[PDB]
Symmetry: D2
């Protein structure tokens, strides 16, 4: 069985290809920051030989306070990815929440994400289906990997056949996530062997961001979807768990020294 390809421009995402990193930041605080943060990625990517896609949310449709920072707005956000694209020649993956924001972001970016909590919102998929851009479906915490075909299915109907599946762990009792490594293959299978990527940072809700991402990668993935802040310690609010930027590179060597070593193994079958 050969793997599917959901190429993002000159980028070819696939399960047998070398892992593609969809790094970035969580929310778009300020460009002065977006760029310092993005700055390092591009440098470490190019230097280490790793495909890359910058990622950042231009909105947070979910929080525990409305009187809080919604986000750079759907308008003042797209413009930031603009100055970003040019200045670094990197792709932009950002999530969307309302059907209307679909087509817009499609033009300003390359990869568009479907928020886990919404992976089951027909009205928004049949819409994210129109743009026809690459889609990244975040595997809902509450859904078994074998049920991922239907989402990939529904997208096909919307006339979109360029989808990637992102895993961020599964519910393990109240208030806790565990990542079932066996679920990565289960998703490849039911998704027409679509690209499976591992969202490590929110899979952890740590010093575990590595050991946990080494295990995923030592299984074989189309890539990692990580996040990091220049000074997590002080920004440490809640939602995902960003990586210490300075450790970006030394941590990505861990991956390649694996995403390769494994990505080039003679197909094994411990089955028969």
């Amino acid at each position: 069985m050969k793997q599917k390809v959901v190429s993002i421009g000159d980028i070819n995402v696939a399960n047998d290809l070398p892992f593609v990193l969809f790094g970035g930041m969580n929310v778009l605080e300020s460009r002065d920051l977006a760029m310092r943060i993005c700055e390092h990625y591009v440098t470490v990517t190019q230097k280490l030989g790793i495909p890359y896609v910058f990622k950042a949310s231009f909105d947070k449709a979910n929080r525990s306070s409305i009187h809080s920072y919604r986000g750079p707005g759907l308008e003042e956000g797209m413009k930031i990815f603009q100055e970003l694209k040019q200045t670094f020649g990197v792709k932009i993956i950002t999530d969307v929440h309302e059907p209307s924001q679909a087509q817009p972001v499609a033009d300003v970016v390359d990869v568009i994400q479907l928020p886990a909590f919404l992976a089951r919102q027909t009205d928004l998929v049949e819409a994210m289906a129109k743009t026809g851009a690459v889609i990244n479906v975040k595997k809902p915490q509450f859904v078994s990997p074998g049920q991922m075909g239907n989402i990939v299915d529904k997208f096909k109907e919307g006339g979109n056949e360029k989808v990637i599946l992102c895993d961020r762990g599964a519910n393990f009792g109240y208030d806790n996530l565990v990542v079932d490594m066996l679920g990565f293959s289960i998703m490849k299978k039911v998704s027409g062997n679509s690209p499976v990527i591992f969202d490590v940072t929110h899979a952890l809700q740590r010093a575990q961001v590595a050991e946990l991402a080494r295990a995923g990668m030592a299984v074989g993935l189309a890539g990692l979807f990580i996040e990091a802040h220049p000074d997590p310690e002080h920004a440490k609010c809640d939602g995902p768990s960003a990586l210490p930027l300075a450790k970006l590179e030394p941590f990505l060597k861990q991956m390649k020294a694996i995403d390769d070593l494994v990505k080039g193994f003679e197909e094994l079958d411990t089955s028969k």
Copy 2:
């Protein structure tokens, strides 16, 4: 500690008051049906002495097929609750998915629901907050009961202090729900002792609809949120698990013979 009250008109919903049944049907197939189905409730309610709120969805924002029946539309749906209200003098609780549908349904109905999968969508809450109608928050499968305060919190800010919490079980491994009876009190506590109701039918994803609803009720609740079809057997698709309409009454005797017996116990403390 006295319980909070989120009265729906002449109806007083509360944890110490007798249980209020929010029965009904799942999706609004056709009025000819809505009414036959609703017909029985009203009869059995009045006859058995049980507060009642008809419930039915006028839309299904989630399915495994877009080429499917979305639903009676936000417009042609509100009109159905119309002929319904008059003809039976019963309240109408229906869920909403997009912020725009908020205020409308508010006028056509009494109780409005926040879809579990969305219990964490600020943009829709701060909006369902404006109408200022009674809200029913479906406890997300993926969220510990102690985290329910924040949703009830956020609503307060939106200027709405009339909320009810509905429990539909918690994730127990891949593809399975279990209802943690201990979670009912945990929710009362963090929600300013708001009305806690038990959504039994989708808590089961059966002959279990009773044994499972007898256990919930034998704990003390502000009410049950059930669903039923006149011929489940043939309609049995997937989503919730409706009750055999003919068994409505004989099954509600089970409850009152409990929602009372228990609702009138001298406060116990096995604590000290």
Copy 3:
């Protein structure tokens, strides 16, 4: 379908019969205590009209310290149930851990228990099978209710057909138990409809001992297996979670007002 009966002497344990309480204490600290503790049960039982079986461990084969109190020993323990039997005309259920202790305890007591952690130890079952006494199998935290037939099966072979199944909740993530009410019927079914009892106190690892035991009972059981200490507060170590003795009675009224009300319902079928 009629229920099975595993009568303990003049006691008839069954799923349709009124619940039988297997109360008692955890470990046998000292007779001066065993008796004060047992004292109250017998009084409240007789007075409230509830079958009763005193229960207490004469040993603790599991702890977090060997330099600790193993227990009254298999010898000096049996003697205590002796002065107990006579003085109160109540049955004695105590757990066993090693095959050798099987036949002995069989003579000194009525009901013998198989420790959950060991429900899968053939060598000890084929032995607890010889005595031929009533057996109480504690449902292992780590085993789905539908797998309980095999234990009941294996016992039959050992030539013992008098078994009762006790449920103490299921694993819900790391360090936590939740009791799946739906599992009570699943066990009745696969166990030739054997007596199913609910071990509430260790199902909780509280002020929840009631709300949690009201839910179980409001489902229908052959009985509850509870535990209590005269001053939990100061004895509060760890293992199970005992009930405040003084609250024994007021808490048992909760049950009968349920174990009856429900135990006498006209068989319902929300199935068809």
Copy 4:
């Protein structure tokens, strides 16, 4: 922090050292088999440069049938490891169930195992503590990794400070196991940094034996504890899930190409 060492003879087991494989078979069917099966290991081990310990049970204290094959008996079993030791100069790790079998097996073997279901049986630990041999504690399906210190603790008291911790996954709903990769470090920490090994085959209750064991190893372990049969297909009963013997080697290359690559990384800290 440096890792602890629980050397089994000329073998040095540790978390930073290269992984030690505790392969073998499940139950001791017949020597003619034990040896063909063991035969391959030794060959592939020596040839690939991997420490090795043969493993096989001489007994099965747990099954779903007493009229079944208990096992080669504690006596006729020890003798088999005898002809085995000599003929291959490999260590023998076998589990024990009753305190009496402790000291015996200690003499005939090198590494002795404590059966998961019993990891909490003081009476057997304080006994497996006397021999003073290397102990391998199988992490109970039902116990959070952070609670593993106490077992390692209790052993110390029994006067034994040579213990290894084996992980075989955690309960994920009824009838299912998932291996939480993050739990490997949590165990190292609370066990005085004792050797942590990954029991992959029963962690699966497949073609997953590799992808699942690549993830564990790509985290860093003191070794793998695997099992395999020459013709699984026809022996496929139930308990663990053995590996196709012929695939032993090609599968162990997967590991070394990882247990090394990772075992020699410059300590990283994604913490600060």
